[PDB]
Design an enzyme around this catalytic site. Sequence first.
Site, PDB file in Angstrom:
ATOM      1  N   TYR A  57      -5.682   1.686   8.349  1.00 28.83           N
ATOM      2  CA  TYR A  57      -6.867   1.318   8.330  1.00 28.83           C
ATOM      3  C   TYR A  57      -7.426   1.029   6.904  1.00 28.83           C
ATOM      4  O   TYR A  57      -7.863   1.662   6.082  1.00 28.83           O
ATOM      5  CB  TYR A  57      -7.631   2.695   9.111  1.00 28.83           C
ATOM      6  CG  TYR A  57      -7.377   2.877  10.326  1.00 28.83           C
ATOM      7  CD1 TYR A  57      -6.337   2.178  11.077  1.00 28.83           C
ATOM      8  CD2 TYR A  57      -7.599   4.139  10.822  1.00 28.83           C
ATOM      9  CE1 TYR A  57      -6.102   2.515  12.378  1.00 28.83           C
ATOM     10  CE2 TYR A  57      -7.344   4.546  12.098  1.00 28.83           C
ATOM     11  CZ  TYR A  57      -6.462   3.819  12.962  1.00 28.83           C
ATOM     12  OH  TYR A  57      -6.167   4.229  14.184  1.00 28.83           O
ATOM     13  N   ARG A 245     -25.965   7.197  15.363  1.00 27.57           N
ATOM     14  CA  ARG A 245     -24.990   7.080  16.506  1.00 27.57           C
ATOM     15  C   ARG A 245     -23.948   8.361  16.406  1.00 27.57           C
ATOM     16  O   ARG A 245     -23.673   8.720  17.672  1.00 27.57           O
ATOM     17  CB  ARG A 245     -24.283   5.988  16.574  1.00 27.57           C
ATOM     18  CG  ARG A 245     -25.002   4.654  17.094  1.00 27.57           C
ATOM     19  CD  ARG A 245     -24.149   3.479  17.000  1.00 27.57           C
ATOM     20  NE  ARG A 245     -24.930   2.312  17.502  1.00 27.57           N
ATOM     21  CZ  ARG A 245     -24.552   1.140  17.705  1.00 27.57           C
ATOM     22  NH1 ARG A 245     -23.419   0.751  17.295  1.00 27.57           N
ATOM     23  NH2 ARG A 245     -25.171   0.254  18.476  1.00 27.57           N
ATOM     24  N   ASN A 249     -23.716  10.549  19.838  1.00 26.56           N
ATOM     25  CA  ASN A 249     -22.459  10.712  20.318  1.00 26.56           C
ATOM     26  C   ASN A 249     -22.364  12.405  20.598  1.00 26.56           C
ATOM     27  O   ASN A 249     -21.601  12.891  21.433  1.00 26.56           O
ATOM     28  CB  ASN A 249     -21.166  10.147  19.479  1.00 26.56           C
ATOM     29  CG  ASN A 249     -21.148   8.589  19.571  1.00 26.56           C
ATOM     30  OD1 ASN A 249     -21.680   8.080  20.289  1.00 26.56           O
ATOM     31  ND2 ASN A 249     -20.436   8.212  18.510  1.00 26.56           N
TER      32      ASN A 249
HETATM   33  N1  LIG Z   1      -3.668   5.443  17.498  1.00 27.17           N
HETATM   34  C1  LIG Z   1      -4.070   3.999  17.881  1.00 27.17           C
HETATM   35  O1  LIG Z   1      -3.055   3.296  18.064  1.00 27.17           O
HETATM   36  C2  LIG Z   1      -5.565   3.978  17.933  1.00 27.17           C
HETATM   37  C3  LIG Z   1      -6.495   4.773  17.288  1.00 27.17           C
HETATM   38  N2  LIG Z   1      -7.769   4.596  17.051  1.00 27.17           N
HETATM   39  C4  LIG Z   1      -8.482   5.576  16.796  1.00 27.17           C
HETATM   40  O2  LIG Z   1      -9.641   5.890  17.527  1.00 27.17           O
HETATM   41  C5  LIG Z   1     -10.855   5.793  17.157  1.00 27.17           C
HETATM   42  C6  LIG Z   1     -11.962   5.209  18.290  1.00 27.17           C
HETATM   43  O3  LIG Z   1     -11.372   4.026  18.653  1.00 27.17           O
HETATM   44  P1  LIG Z   1     -12.172   2.541  18.350  1.00 27.17           P
HETATM   45  O4  LIG Z   1     -11.084   1.624  18.230  1.00 27.17           O
HETATM   46  O5  LIG Z   1     -12.573   2.783  16.980  1.00 27.17           O
HETATM   47  O6  LIG Z   1     -13.371   2.408  19.418  1.00 27.17           O
HETATM   48  P2  LIG Z   1     -14.499   3.368  20.028  1.00 27.17           P
HETATM   49  O7  LIG Z   1     -14.199   3.160  21.576  1.00 27.17           O
HETATM   50  O8  LIG Z   1     -14.750   4.551  19.270  1.00 27.17           O
HETATM   51  O9  LIG Z   1     -15.694   2.301  19.912  1.00 27.17           O
HETATM   52  C7  LIG Z   1     -15.948   2.013  18.696  1.00 27.17           C
HETATM   53  C8  LIG Z   1     -17.321   0.791  18.564  1.00 27.17           C
HETATM   54  O10 LIG Z   1     -18.303   1.363  19.315  1.00 27.17           O
HETATM   55  C9  LIG Z   1     -19.528   1.463  18.608  1.00 27.17           C
HETATM   56  N3  LIG Z   1     -20.225   2.662  18.789  1.00 27.17           N
HETATM   57  C10 LIG Z   1     -20.139   3.937  18.369  1.00 27.17           C
HETATM   58  N4  LIG Z   1     -20.813   4.757  19.127  1.00 27.17           N
HETATM   59  C11 LIG Z   1     -22.027   4.162  19.649  1.00 27.17           C
HETATM   60  C12 LIG Z   1     -23.023   4.609  20.422  1.00 27.17           C
HETATM   61  N5  LIG Z   1     -23.401   5.658  20.531  1.00 27.17           N
HETATM   62  N6  LIG Z   1     -23.841   3.426  21.113  1.00 27.17           N
HETATM   63  C13 LIG Z   1     -23.074   2.057  20.847  1.00 27.17           C
HETATM   64  N7  LIG Z   1     -22.132   1.639  20.006  1.00 27.17           N
HETATM   65  C14 LIG Z   1     -21.466   2.602  19.704  1.00 27.17           C
HETATM   66  C15 LIG Z   1     -19.095   1.168  17.073  1.00 27.17           C
HETATM   67  O11 LIG Z   1     -19.942   0.457  16.375  1.00 27.17           O
HETATM   68  P3  LIG Z   1     -20.566   0.927  14.833  1.00 27.17           P
HETATM   69  O12 LIG Z   1     -19.603   1.665  14.092  1.00 27.17           O
HETATM   70  O13 LIG Z   1     -21.002  -0.312  14.237  1.00 27.17           O
HETATM   71  O14 LIG Z   1     -21.754   2.087  15.193  1.00 27.17           O
HETATM   72  C16 LIG Z   1     -17.874   0.504  17.070  1.00 27.17           C
HETATM   73  O15 LIG Z   1     -18.155  -0.990  17.432  1.00 27.17           O
HETATM   74  C17 LIG Z   1     -10.556   4.714  15.975  1.00 27.17           C
HETATM   75  O16 LIG Z   1     -11.697   4.549  15.202  1.00 27.17           O
HETATM   76  C18 LIG Z   1      -9.205   5.290  15.452  1.00 27.17           C
HETATM   77  O17 LIG Z   1      -9.513   6.587  14.798  1.00 27.17           O
HETATM   78  C19 LIG Z   1      -8.103   3.340  17.851  1.00 27.17           C
HETATM   79  C20 LIG Z   1      -7.374   2.328  18.302  1.00 27.17           C
HETATM   80  C21 LIG Z   1      -5.895   2.564  18.228  1.00 27.17           C
END
Ligand SMILES: NC(=O)C1=CN([C@@H]2O[C@H](COP(=O)(O)OP(=O)(O)OC[C@H]3O[C@@H](n4cnc5c(N)ncnc54)[C@H](OP(=O)(O)O)[C@@H]3O)[C@@H](O)[C@H]2O)C=CC1
Length: 281
Positions: A57, A245, A249
């Site tokens: 990351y 957020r 959450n």
């Molecule tokens: N092991 C693997 O291969 C993987 C691991 N991961 C892990 O899982 C975590 C979570 O998955 P991720 O892919 O980030 O996606 P998420 O499903 O957690 O969604 C993240 C997105 O949602 C937005 N968001 C968060 N909270 C809210 C809310 N309450 N209302 C509206 N929008 C919201 C964020 O925007 P903003 O930040 O601008 O608020 C961001 O754009 C990752 O960060 C990582 O740590 C993810 C993918 C693959």
Amino acid sequence: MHDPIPTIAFPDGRKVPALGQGTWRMGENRAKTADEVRSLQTGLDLGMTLIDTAEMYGDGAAERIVGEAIKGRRDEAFVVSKVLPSNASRAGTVAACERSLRNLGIDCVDLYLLHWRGGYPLAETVAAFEELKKAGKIRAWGVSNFDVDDMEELSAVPDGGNVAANQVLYNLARRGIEFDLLPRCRAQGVPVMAYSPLDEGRLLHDADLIHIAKAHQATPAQVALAFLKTCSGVISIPKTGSPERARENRDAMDIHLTTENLAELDRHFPPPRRKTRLEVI
Ligand SMILES: NC(=O)C1=CN([C@@H]2O[C@H](COP(=O)(O)OP(=O)(O)OC[C@H]3O[C@@H](n4cnc5c(N)ncnc54)[C@H](OP(=O)(O)O)[C@@H]3O)[C@@H](O)[C@H]2O)C=CC1
């Protein structure tokens, strides 16, 4: 007032709250850094004590964000990081862990995952993980993006039964693991970490999710997380760069989904009726 967040037990008996925090895409924009740190700190304060990161990351940048967020409070965080499969040879895994510890500014990570399956023998990666555990550099190891066949291969390697978690894609729009992998992991006592629990935001435009959220005076994101809270043996890890957020959450844990709500979600987001290819991001 909030009810406490439910806990999830690892095979080693350690318990963590069922709602944690993600960090993918943190550390990219200097104007967002302060608030990304604040988001993670706010989550820690609110009992979202697991923080998920990876060497991938921002090539260490997200780890450095986590390292700043946990300054003066390391003991309150359950820190997860990951090794890329291209680095998952025995010497490679040890070197990757050392880089991660330096970026995080800590002595020991709580849980260290193989990020997905690669070309190095699994026995070698596991041997490195066990060496790191004996060294006091990790407390536990696990895997990520492991399908049922990948999990089976752990029984063929020494110490493969020590797997502590499988981190896979799981959300209302991505329910494939329910047919096979999730029941298997539950039966083994291995927590599933549900990554991208909001489907990276894509799920939040769903009509039915919007409808149910309106009925609860809640947001679609809160309903998506409330769904995962009803799934035993699952830790969700939503990511946000916004402390507002992070608070939202946390508040998802206060939603009481009704029997009718859960039936409705199953109509609109149909569970799998057959084995399906593991979906990944
Ligand atoms: N092991 C693997 O291969 C993987 C691991 N991961 C892990 O899982 C975590 C979570 O998955 P991720 O892919 O980030 O996606 P998420 O499903 O957690 O969604 C993240 C997105 O949602 C937005 N968001 C968060 N909270 C809210 C809310 N309450 N209302 C509206 N929008 C919201 C964020 O925007 P903003 O930040 O601008 O608020 C961001 O754009 C990752 O960060 C990582 O740590 C993810 C993918 C693959």
